[PDB]
Ligand binder design. Structure first.
Ligand SMILES: Nc1nc2c(ncn2[C@@H]2O[C@H](COP(=O)(O)OP(=O)(O)O)[C@@H](O)[C@H]2O)c(=O)[nH]1
Ligand SMILES: [Mg+2]
Ligand SMILES: [Mg+2]
Ligand code: NA
Ligand code: NA
Ligand code: NA
Ligand code: NA
Length: 414
């Protein structure tokens, strides 16, 4: 039979609102992650979506139909058992223009991505561009472009759009990114997509000797219906491990941690705890490695792990030396244009005293620019950040026309 292992790779699903991201994740995994009525009432799904699947190959059948997402070869007309390849997970990022920050949060977890482009809409829509550029900046360059909703357009329309997309990727880092036509709704040509995922989004090399670091996704910020969060022994903290590994019974800390407030003075103090259990999907494990949304059981009271006063952005081993900073220095670069805006806009230079939004790991923090000199800024953060490394790229956003727009990026210098 097929093994039960944790997912070994995270694949983002990005693109403009209503282009078919959640439907595509369903076509691949069988799982619809969002709540239909909530989406109806709000006109959007604000949480990240998360789902998993095993991937196999029927070695007798021919490709792409030989690829399967369950232990059967019936889809390619064979009674043989498919060979297990790997388990993968998807991170369904919101496409709505008011939700870039959430997308950026999700993007911190991606090892690769699928950009979903609706065939029946003008390419490229504002969040098509914004998400594409964000992926570029962050370094999620193992990309597949999917032309979705091919069932509603003619061959000529699809061809025309294809030419637009080729023209778009031409002369960029994505010049050789494949473009795969599908219908997510009708599950048309999904096997070619799986084939593409195996070809273009290889599981990255993981150096398990690195210090363990996990980026935290608060439970209120994610729809992960398939992942067990058992509070029997205490609060469960979900997220994704970006380096090293964690093990049951290990001592860990949540950083920046708990908001304290002693005599007008405000600080965030680390929350130490211990791993009581580790879960992926509906299975328990002795250890957890990068890839997948892991559920780390602790011995903490759930009232703490769910608290607004807990700034839980990362988890590390208890021994880890991690600066927690209220004021940071960033060596930045600005985009030329506000790529996510409807109007054609140049991004203005960074000005002292302006408010910026900083995406660091899975966290989002507003800050005031105290100093701007050359290609470095100093910013006083509304809440501190935990800087677990010297090589950390933050994404910079600015409020424009009542929405937060990505305008650039930088290195957090410590
Ligand atoms: N005709 C057609 N409709 C689709 C397809 N994929 C998604 N849709 C529809 O388009 C709408 C947007 O899909 P959704 O996955 O919610 O887009 P998201 O906002 O990017 O997650 C939904 O009503 C889907 O039923 C497709 O391949 N063909
Ligand atoms: Mg959706
Ligand atoms: Mg139909
Ligand atoms: Na599956
Ligand atoms: Na198949
Ligand atoms: Na990544
Ligand atoms: Na068609």
């Amino acid at each position: 039979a097929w093994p039960k292992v944790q997912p070994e790779v995270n694949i983002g699903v990005v693109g403009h609102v209503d282009h078919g991201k959640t439907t595509l994740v369903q076509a691949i995994t069988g799982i619809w992650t969002s709540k239909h009525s909530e989406e109806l009432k709000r006109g959007m799904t604000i949480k990240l979506g998360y789902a998993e699947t095993n991937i196999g190959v029927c070695e007798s059948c021919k490709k792409p139909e030989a690829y399967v997402t369950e232990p059967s070869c019936k889809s390619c007309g064979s009674d043989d058992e498919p060979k297990f390849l790997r388990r993968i997970s998807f991170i369904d990022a919101p496409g709505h223009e008011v939700l870039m920050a959430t997308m950026l949060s999700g993007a911190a977890l991606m090892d690769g991505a699928i950009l979903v482009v609706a065939a029946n809409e003008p390419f490229p829509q504002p969040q098509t561009r914004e998400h594409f550029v964000a992926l570029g900046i962050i370094g999620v360059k193992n990309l597949i472009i999917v032309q979705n909703k091919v069932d509603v357009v003619s061959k000529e329309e699809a061809l025309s759009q294809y030419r637009q997309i080729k023209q778009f990727t031409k002369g960029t880092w994505a010049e050789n990114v494949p473009i795969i036509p599908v219908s997510a709704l009708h599950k048309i040509n999904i096997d070619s997509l799986i084939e593409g995922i195996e070809e273009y989004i290889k599981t990255p090399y993981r150096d398990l000797s690195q210090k363990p670091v996990m980026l935290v996704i608060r439970s209120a910020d994610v729809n992960a219906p398939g992942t067990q969060f058992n509070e029997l022994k205490g609060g469960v903290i979900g997220g994704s491990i970006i380096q090293g590994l964690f093990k049951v019974d290990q001592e860990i800390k949540v950083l920046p941690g708990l908001r304290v407030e002693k005599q007008g003075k405000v600080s965030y103090e680390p929350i130490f705890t211990k791993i009581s259990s580790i879960a992926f999907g509906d299975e328990e494990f002795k250890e957890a490695k990068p890839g997948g949304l892991v559920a780390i059981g602790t011995y903490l009271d759930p009232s703490l792990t769910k608290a607004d006063n807990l700034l839980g952005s990362i988890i590390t081993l208890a021994d880890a030396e991690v600066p927690v900073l209220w004021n940071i220095r960033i060596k930045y670069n600005l985009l030329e244009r506000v790529v996510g805006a409807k109007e054609m806009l140049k991004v203005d230079p960074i000005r002292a005293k302006e408010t910026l939004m900083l995406s660091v790991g899975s966290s989002t923090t507003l800050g005031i620019v105290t100093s701007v000199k050359k290609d470095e800024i100093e910013v006083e953060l509304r809440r501190p950040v935990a800087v677990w490394s010297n090589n950390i790229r933050t994404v910079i956003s600015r409020q424009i026309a009542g929405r937060w727009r990505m305008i650039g990026w930088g290195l957090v210098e410590i």
